[PDB]
Each structure stands twice: as structure tokens, then as C-alpha cells.
Amino acid sequence: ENVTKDIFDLRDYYSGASKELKNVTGYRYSKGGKHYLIFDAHQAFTRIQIFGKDIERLKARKNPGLDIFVVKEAENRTVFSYGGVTKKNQGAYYDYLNAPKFVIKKEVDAGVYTHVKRHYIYKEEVSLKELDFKLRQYLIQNFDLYKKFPKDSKIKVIMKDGGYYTFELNKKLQPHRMSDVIDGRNIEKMEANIR
Numbered sequence: 001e002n003v004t005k006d007i008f009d010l011r012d013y014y015s016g017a018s019k020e021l022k023n024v025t026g027y028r029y030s031k032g033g034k035h036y037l038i039f040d041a042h043q044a045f046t047r048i049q050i051f052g053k054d055i056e057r058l059k060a061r062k063n064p065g066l067d068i069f070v071v072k073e074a075e076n077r078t079v080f081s082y083g084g085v086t087k088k089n090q091g092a093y094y095d096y097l098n099a100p101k102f103v104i105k106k107e108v109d110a111g112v113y114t115h116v117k118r119h120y121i122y123k124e125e126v127s128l129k130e131l132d133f134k135l136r137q138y139l140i141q142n143f144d145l146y147k148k149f150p151k152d153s154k155i156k157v158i159m160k161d162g163g164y165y166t167f168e169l170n171k172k173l174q175p176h177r178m179s180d181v182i183d184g185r186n187i188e189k190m191e192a193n194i195r
């Protein structure tokens with residue numbers, strides 16, 4: 001299929017680099033009525049822009065023990081990443097916390113091809129920013145996501161109580177959702193329906 005540049009950009013975004021910061025200390029900083037987390041003379045890390053809902057869980061200024069999922073976003077002024085902040089595990093685990101199956105269904109030649117796989121969850125608090133990125137990346141590399149027009153392609157994260165989270169794959173995840181945090185242990189199963 002003969003896809004437009006916004007699909008290319010989505011493909012480039014989601015197979016770009018990402019970086020997991022763990023148990024890091026971040027410092028609160030506002031400049032021009034926007035809210036950021038910064039680090040240390042010594043940690044030449046990407047600036048994290050944060051949101052209203054992040055503030056409600058952060059402290060006046062210094063903030064140890066954070067886990068950040070960083071994705072470089074492209075230039076303003078300087079380079080930023082949106083959201084992806086969570087608290088470190090409190091529990092101690094042998095390996096992972098949860099392994100819900102990720103059932104991948106791909107429309108094809110008058111058929112559907114299904115692949116089941118496990119997705120290994122390490123964090124008590126996992127942001128939607130991270131499940132969106134890693135999942136779509138996986139699907140780009142292993143299932144040809146964004147080679148054809150995605151149309152209604154969706155990822156669904158389904159919880160134990162039945163509550164779910166949907167990632168419409170024809171658009172980038174809206175900024176304000178990158179700070180939504182769900183409980184890693186209560187993820188029941190995961191679904192993708194794609195072309």
C-alpha cells in the first residue's frame with residue numbers, strides 16, 4: 001500500500017530509540033508556565049515535560065525513587081520527552097510481576113493470522129506511554145505495522161476487572177495520556193487488531 005507522510009512519521013516515531021530510567025532522582029522546575037523534571041549537573045539526561053496529574057503525585061521540589069520512560073520528541077526553542085513518570089517498585093520479585101498474553105490478530109488474504117506471546121511486566125506502576133511505545137514498536141518490527149494504512153487498527157490493554165485502555169494506531173498517543181499510570185499486576189491480557 002501507498003501510505004502518506006503521517007504514517008511514515010508514526011513508523012519513525014515508534015521505531016525510534018527509547019530509554020528506561022530507573023530509581024532516578026528528579027527535580028521540579030517550571031519555566032513559562034509549563035512543568036518539567038530536570039536532573040543533575042552530572043546526569044546529561046533528556047528533560048521531561050510533565051502534566052497536571054503528575055504534579056498531584058510529586059513533591060514541592062526534590063523527588064527520589066522515580067522510574068521514567070523517556071522518548072525524545074523533536075525540537076522547540078531544545079529536546080524534551082512528554083510524561084512517562086512512575087514510582088519505583090516497592091515489592092521485591094524473583095523476575096517479573098506478571099506475564100499477560102498479547103494476542104495479535106492481523107487482517108490478511110481473506111483471513112486473519114493470530115500470534116500469541118507473553119508480555120513480561122516488571123513494574124508495579126506502568127505508564128500508558130510505555131505500553132503504547134513498546135507494543136507498537138514490537139508490531140512494527142515483527143508484524144509490518146504501518147507498511148499498509150492502519151485504518152481502524154487498535155491495541156487494547158484489558159485489566160482483571162474488565163476496564164481497558166485503547167490505543168488507536170492511526171494516530172500518535174495524545175500527550176495528556178502519557179502520564180496515565182495503571183497497575184502492572186492487574187493487567188489481565190492484551191490485544192492487537194491490525195493490517
Ligand SMILES: CC(=O)N[C@@H]1[C@@H](O[C@@H]2O[C@@H](C)[C@@H](O)[C@@H](O)[C@@H]2O)[C@H](O[C@@H]2O[C@H](CO)[C@H](O)[C@H](O[C@]3(C(=O)O)C[C@H](O)[C@@H](NC(C)=O)[C@H]([C@H](O)[C@H](O)CO)O3)[C@H]2O)[C@@H](CO)O[C@H]1O
Pocket residue numbers: 128163164165166167168174177180
Ligand atoms: C478529538 C479527540 O481526540 N478527543 C480525544 C478523545 O478521543 C476521541 O474520543 C474517543 C472516544 C474516540 O472516538 C477517539 O477516536 C476520538 O478521537 C479521547 O477519548 C479517548 O480516546 C481513546 C482512544 O483514543 C479511548 O477511546 C478512550 O476511552 C477509554 C479507552 O478505551 O482507552 C475508555 C475506557 O473505559 C477508559 N478506561 C478506564 C476508565 O478504565 C480509558 C482510560 O480513561 C484511558 O485509556 C486513559 O488514558 O479510556 C477515550 O477516552 C480523550 C481522552 O483522552 O481526549 C480527547 O482529546
Ligand SMILES: [Cl-]
Pocket residue numbers: none
Ligand atoms: Cl499458556
